[PDB]
Amino acid sequence: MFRTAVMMAASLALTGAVVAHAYYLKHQFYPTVVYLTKSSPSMAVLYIQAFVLVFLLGKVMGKVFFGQLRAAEMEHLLERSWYAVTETCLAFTVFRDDFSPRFVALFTLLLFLKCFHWLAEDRVDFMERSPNISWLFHCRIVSLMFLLGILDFLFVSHAYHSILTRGASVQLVFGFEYAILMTMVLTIFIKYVLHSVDLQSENPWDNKAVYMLYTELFTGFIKVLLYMAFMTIMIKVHTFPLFAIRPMYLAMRQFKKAVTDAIMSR
Amino acid sequence: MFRTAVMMAASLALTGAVVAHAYYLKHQFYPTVVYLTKSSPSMAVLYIQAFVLVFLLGKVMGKVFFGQLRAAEMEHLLERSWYAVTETCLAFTVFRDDFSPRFVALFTLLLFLKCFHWLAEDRVDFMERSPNISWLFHCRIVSLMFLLGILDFLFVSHAYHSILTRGASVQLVFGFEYAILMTMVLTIFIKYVLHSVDLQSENPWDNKAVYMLYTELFTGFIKVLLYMAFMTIMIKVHTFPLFAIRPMYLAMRQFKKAVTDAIMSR
Amino acid sequence: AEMMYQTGMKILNGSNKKSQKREAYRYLQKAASMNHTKALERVSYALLFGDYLPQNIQAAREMFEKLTEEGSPKGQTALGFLYASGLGVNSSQAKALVYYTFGALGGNLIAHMVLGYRYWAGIGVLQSCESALTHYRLVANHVASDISLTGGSVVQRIRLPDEVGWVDGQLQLGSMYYNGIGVKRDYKQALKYFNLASQGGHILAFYNLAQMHASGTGVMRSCHTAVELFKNVCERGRWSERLMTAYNSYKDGDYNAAVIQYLLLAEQGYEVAQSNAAFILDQREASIVGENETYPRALLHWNRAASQGYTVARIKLGDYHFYGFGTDVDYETAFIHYRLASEQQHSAQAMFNLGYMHEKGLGIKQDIHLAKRFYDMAAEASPDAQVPVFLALCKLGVVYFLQYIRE
Amino acid sequence: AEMMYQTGMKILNGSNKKSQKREAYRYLQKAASMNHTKALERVSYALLFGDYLPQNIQAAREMFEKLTEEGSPKGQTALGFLYASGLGVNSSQAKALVYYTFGALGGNLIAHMVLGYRYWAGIGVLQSCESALTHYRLVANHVASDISLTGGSVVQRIRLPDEVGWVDGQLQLGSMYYNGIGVKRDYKQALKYFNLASQGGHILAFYNLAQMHASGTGVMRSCHTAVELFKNVCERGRWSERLMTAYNSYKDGDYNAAVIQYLLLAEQGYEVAQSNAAFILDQREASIVGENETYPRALLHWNRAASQGYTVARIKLGDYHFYGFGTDVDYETAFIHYRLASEQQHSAQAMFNLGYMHEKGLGIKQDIHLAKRFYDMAAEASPDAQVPVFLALCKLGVVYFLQYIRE
Amino acid sequence: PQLSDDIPFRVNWPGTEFSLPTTGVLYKEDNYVIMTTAHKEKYKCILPLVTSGDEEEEKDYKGPNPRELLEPLFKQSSCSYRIESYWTYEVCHGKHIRQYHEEKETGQKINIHEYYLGNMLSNEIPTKNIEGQMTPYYPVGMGNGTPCSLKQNRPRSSTVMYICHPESKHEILSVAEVTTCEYEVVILTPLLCSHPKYRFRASPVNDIFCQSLPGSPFKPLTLRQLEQQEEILR
Amino acid sequence: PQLSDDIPFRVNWPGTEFSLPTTGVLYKEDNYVIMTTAHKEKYKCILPLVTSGDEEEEKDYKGPNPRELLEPLFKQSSCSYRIESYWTYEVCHGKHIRQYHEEKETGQKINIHEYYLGNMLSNEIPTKNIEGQMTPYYPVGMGNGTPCSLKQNRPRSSTVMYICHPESKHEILSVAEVTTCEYEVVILTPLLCSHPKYRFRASPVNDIFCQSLPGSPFKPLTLRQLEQQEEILR
């Protein structure tokens, strides 16, 4: 806890130093803020402060939504988040959208929601094998389920009305990624429905595994369909993605690990 | 092996269909090759046949330098390689170097050499715990030691004369990355030197671990110095990397796992 | 009869619709049956031209004859075009000129441009700049009058072998400098002020320097600059809109009306309309001309398009002598037309195929190290020659290495 | 004496080196001791100007007096500049004009531009366009003559508050249209052809329309266009190079010679040299002027720079009445100069500070929903107002929400 | 230096035998300068004390009250309007203030968004401002306009501002609001410039007199002349 | 149509009583056309058979051998040179070919890279394709130049190509190489154009005589006003 406060103070000291340097130069409100926006190191330090703020908000949201990290999903977050920040960075830079301080914020919002879906993934994965779970866990995780699903529905609606009204831009890829995240909250619902009808009966159910495999096959098909439509759109319009082929290979492997295993079983 | 020959033939069937499409359009030598260059799908299939050709050359180079993959480094290449495919892809597009089919071919030369350094690391890591190693293994891996380190010395020499004669361009990040790869062949040498004096004596040596921890401290200090100088340059000239912070956090963690462990030990 | 012609011109000038233009000509075609000598000459140039009336070349030849026997300038001009191009009728250059002279005599302006162009490039007659000065002059006076009235209708120049205020006042100031408005006339310095007005693109200045180089005022009267300055004025008449009537026929799939509406302007002496009227005959899309008179007629219009300074028409005159298109195969003759597009126009391809005739010993005696120069020269001339020289130079060194092994 | 002045002008015109220019003036400074009446006027304009001789204002005042008693136009002009600017001497506008009149009488051109500008902007005298017509002409005749000889030496216009052929022949054609060269004169149509020549940027055309709007030829003679067309001709003399002599003093760290070499051109009636001569006095870098006469003198040159149409000089005249710089604090007076830079010049900042006086109830009565309009209007006017309105509108709604809770 | 760009000056040449006026601006015998022209003509130009104080202009007015001058403007019903970037203000002097904008539909319809800002059913003249400077005015204030939603359906009010201009043709400098849905209109008229307390205020001119020294004429050997030279172009 | 842009034509007006020539080009009585001008003027304009065959021009030449014509060019020592993009070829007629290019150093030195291509210590005239045309030439072949590294220190050789031009001033059309380090030079001269077998070949002109039908005069009424009009303009 000491190092977190040390990092926050060491970021706020630089932010205050940059703000005071600008205010000593241009002694008013409006030229000071305009000078902050045009200057590169000033906006860089403001970016650093914004990232530390969203980091602390993420930490308090993880504290209020999960009681304690298992220290086995913290790594899974670290590699998958590196994956993700590099994919968002490359998608931001190929599209020639230019560095704007209101679309970087949207991209970190997308990354933040992706991290929370992955945390929900691993929490329900341990809920599969947890014999002692209180009602607080159930209520908080189903609150996470809703909130996430409603958020991706809202952003999908916003992005498809954007792609209808404005024209071809980055809002299309934003809406498609939020549609994939919508399929993700769909997967965990069905998984939580099956593992909740598992716990309420003091006997194992053989049909639960079949339903889980069928649902995984389902949504794997939906995911590869979305990725293929995503491809066949951006070869046609703008430029080759050069990104999003990462989780696609994992999406076809998700289809491979579900369809072929069910074919070998059934 | 059947799926490998299928993949080669299904790529060469597309190249022989793209070439025969252009030759019917422009019935000569010179306007055909020019037509392939300017056309996007014609250069796309010629890119695919190039990558399959460098894939099969890698598989035959892996077959002659390593007798058999252990199927524990086969995964370990796949995440790193992905790591490496994406950051070269992001460094290629951030720099505005434009898509040229002789600098893409240079970037996959870096990635092809980067994959072979990583394969040498995991092979020498099990050279620590292999009590039955033939003289064929010893000679075929010091050949990989020489062939790599001379190659990065050549490309560093090609790049630091390119940074002086021509000016600031993408040839700076090539020779710097090969300099890190020059430290990478430096690491596996000393590790091979200390583990060769281990096998020739039928008794463990306590100073071998002390030299190994000192050697990892060494080069780790060299590595962060290379990355930190790599930071200070491209903020000054051109633009923010937005890449190469991937292995840097692993480079500080390499320095963290070496210096702090030695401080705790000694 | 005469009442029918008024309805057609009213709907033509009043309606730009394609159906209304064809509906206007229905009375005009009916008035042609009444032998109104003004009525046929507007449907003669549709019966054989297309994109108006349906194309029927044999239906226009016999009624052109009565236009000739009447003595119409618009009939004497076009019947010469039939025998010059061998179009529906056996080709004869002998009396193709006879019809064009009487059309030029009769007051037609097309028969003066072609007769002038034939006297200028030496086609069908002796190249005489004196005779090419006289006929090109009469067109220039009859087009410089109308541009000052019509405002200079500009038309785009489209070449199929490539795809498929501030200065207005300077003309009057330069006119006063040569003539003298309040100052003594000075022909030594009024030349530079008048010549700089033509670099803006206006063709009124193009006329005034032609007369300057004609009578010998200011600069000594040279033949080469006398008519070349005249010619670019004549290439922008009301017949300059006829590329669009021909080019729209090419995009509409009527390829046999883009080879007749282009062969007139090829006869009129263009280079946008002499490559394009040969490129269509290059790919055998035309059907009026036979399958055996398709390449020699496309050789004629590739030859005129090269002598007027076109890069592709000098490479593509090398190809027709390289493979044997319309001529017995000549590697020596094809050799020259490839170098003439290398030293003169610096065409990047034209030294690559110079390497092939150097590397493989065609036309001249083989030398391996001479061929290396022209492949290397190709990469310096263009950015697009970097690739197809590299796969040619690698093949070049394989022969040199394999021959050295056998020794 | 006279032999010493020849050596200085030879090295000045022969060597452009800074040391050689100072070495040339060593004989000129020694010749000033011999009271050669041509020698002092080249060193009087260095003793008080700088970037030549070392700057010493008091060392030039007493030797200007003997230049006045001799009756030198170059001494009568500059001695009025001392009392107009209060420079080293107590300020007095009363006989500042008296010295400028006799300099204008004496044949000096600087004393005519300043007297003309004072009659044009109504500074020190009544604004009379008739008197501003007379003095601004004499300069225009004496500058258009040399520009035809010197080629019109262009000088860049540098404002410190921001950082720190084809038409040549149209002038002679438009001159012949008004006068008549072989045609009847028509003043109704020669106006449009002559006025279009000035849009190219050449200033010979700027002279010729000024006389056109002076005598009433073509268009009725209006005062506003009579001298404004005249003025931009006068602002491009051989004294237009004096920005670079002043601007180089600013970049070389000699800030006290960029406030004297700029205050003359501020007196001469510029706007590049009236903001910059006030921006230097804004930050108190000047040392000749006292610390208590630094803001009222910078208010005077911010006031003249605003009435000549500058955006920043109208915002920065709001600031000086907003905080209380050089004046007792006036929120009502500062209010007007902020909106006069909003409706007129559409300065993006000038409606943001309109919001602050609307939101916080300064100058006028407070109204919360009126302030919302101008913050919103700020974001429409510029791309850079998107940020500092958003943190202003969020603060705006916090007060509106917190007040509603207390109710 | 303090607001020094408002003090007018004038040089005169009254000659040798001249007496400085004792009425108007004050004078001194020490603040004289000895002058010299280019052709060696000597002059002695006296200058007044720069005060121009008080308002002792003998302000008398037996004419009509300021109410009576705008009556012929009211009955003639000739009233103007002003354009803006978007809006269009039509003040009608003696009837109303009307603010409206036409919405031109695609081909057939024209839609009007109209509002009503008013309708006609003390020893010191107040002074507002006007472009920074100073001007006494006539205020004409009304209300009972269209209801304003921000003031909870209260009718708008408006004050009419009258300032005089000689070349005016009844136009508007600007329209402005001191608060929401209550607007201020300034109107140019030529009627009030005859009123001494309502006319455009001009500062008194301080006269600079140049006494001709002996050996120099009544006016300098370059004056008169050069003046008449342009007298050509008069 | 086959190479038809090399056949000259000429219309003449010999009139009513004219007999077609039996020497030169062949004629027929069937290939006549009946003509009509704009002013209703009838003409019968006959045409020849377009053969222009053989070389029966009675080729006789009692003059000197072609060797003797270039001797005054050799002794006068007036010889030219040609520029290119990089190189500079200086052929000297009767002495040498010199190929060199100057390397201008930064201020003081000039470096010369020079080579030597030569030095002077049959019933059918051969012809070479010149721009695809048929010109017979005089070859002057010569060697013993500087050694060539590609041919293992063999001296270069060169042939001098002579073709005639009336307005020539001893310049070069182009310099070309048939093989490595052995070069070909073409030279324009006016001396060989007097030689009947060496002159510039012009095809014989086929004459279009045309006879005037009764009711029409010797020349058309719309013709003679035009050749006098250009005669005035000249």
Ligand SMILES: *[C@@H]1O[C@H](CO)[C@@H](O[C@@H]2O[C@H](CO)[C@@H](O[C@H]3O[C@H](CO[C@H]4O[C@H](CO[C@H]5O[C@H](CO)[C@@H](O)[C@H](O)[C@@H]5O)[C@@H](O)[C@H](O[C@H]5O[C@H](CO)[C@@H](O)[C@H](O)[C@@H]5O)[C@@H]4O)[C@@H](O[C@H]4O[C@H](CO)[C@@H](O)[C@H](O)[C@@H]4O)[C@H](O)[C@@H]3O)[C@H](O)[C@H]2NC(C)=O)[C@H](O)[C@H]1NC(C)=O
């Ligand atoms: C080039 O020219 C273009 C046009 O000439 C410029 O384009 C802009 O075009 C937009 C159109 O989308 C204009 O925006 C608004 O237009 C109408 C009209 O709304 C205006 O009027 C509102 C009236 O409210 C006040 O009315 C009285 C005025 O006397 C007051 O007494 C009263 O109390 C009240 O306050 C006004 O409110 C509004 O201004 C702002 O209002 C609020 C807060 O006040 C702000 O938050 C807003 O941002 C707004 O800017 C407008 O000035 C409007 O339609 C209205 O009427 C329809 C009727 O059906 C309603 O349905 C609708 O909901 C709305 O109420 C539009 O919706 C839109 O809001 C804009 O004014 C134009 N801009 C300019 C500068 O003219 C373009 O800018 C020009 N290019 C440049 C300058 O570079």
Ligand SMILES: *[C@@H]1O[C@H](CO)[C@@H](O[C@@H]2O[C@H](CO)[C@@H](O[C@H]3O[C@H](CO[C@H]4O[C@H](CO[C@H]5O[C@H](CO)[C@@H](O)[C@H](O)[C@@H]5O)[C@@H](O)[C@H](O[C@H]5O[C@H](CO)[C@@H](O)[C@H](O)[C@@H]5O)[C@@H]4O)[C@@H](O[C@H]4O[C@H](CO)[C@@H](O)[C@H](O)[C@@H]4O)[C@H](O)[C@@H]3O)[C@H](O)[C@H]2NC(C)=O)[C@H](O)[C@H]1NC(C)=O
């Ligand atoms: C704008 O103008 C510029 C100049 O006007 C153009 O710039 C180019 O500039 C470069 C300079 O770097 C030139 O390149 C070469 O220049 C010299 C000279 O080498 C030339 O001559 C060589 C001679 O070899 C032949 O000589 C005889 C000729 O009669 C033959 O008989 C003999 O057998 C032999 O074949 C010639 O070989 C060479 O051409 C090519 O040679 C080989 C194979 O033949 C190719 O692989 C090469 O690629 C080469 O192009 C040249 O034409 C050269 O210096 C030489 O001499 C120094 C002396 O110290 C040696 O040290 C050095 O090693 C070398 O031997 C240069 O090194 C360089 O190779 C080039 O010619 C210019 N280009 C043109 C078109 O003029 C610029 O191109 C212009 N811009 C345009 C057109 O857009």
Ligand SMILES: *[C@@H]1O[C@H](CO)[C@@H](O)[C@H](O)[C@H]1NC(C)=O
């Ligand atoms: C054209 O000439 C050929 C050969 O003389 C002949 O066979 C043919 O019938 C002629 N055609 C016409 C239309 O005259």
Ligand SMILES: *[C@@H]1O[C@H](CO)[C@@H](O)[C@H](O)[C@H]1NC(C)=O
């Ligand atoms: C040439 O013309 C003949 C008609 O006599 C036709 O049959 C033939 O196909 C044409 N082409 C060739 C190549 O002979």
Ligand SMILES: *[C@@H]1O[C@H](CO)[C@@H](O)[C@H](O)[C@H]1NC(C)=O
């Ligand atoms: C300027 O005037 C002030 C006040 O009248 C006086 O104190 C000062 O001495 C004067 N200075 C000069 C140089 O005349």
Ligand SMILES: *[C@@H]1O[C@H](CO)[C@@H](O)[C@H](O)[C@H]1NC(C)=O
């Ligand atoms: C004004 O002038 C006086 C000199 O009398 C000086 O002492 C003072 O510092 C100056 N400034 C102020 C603010 O009084």
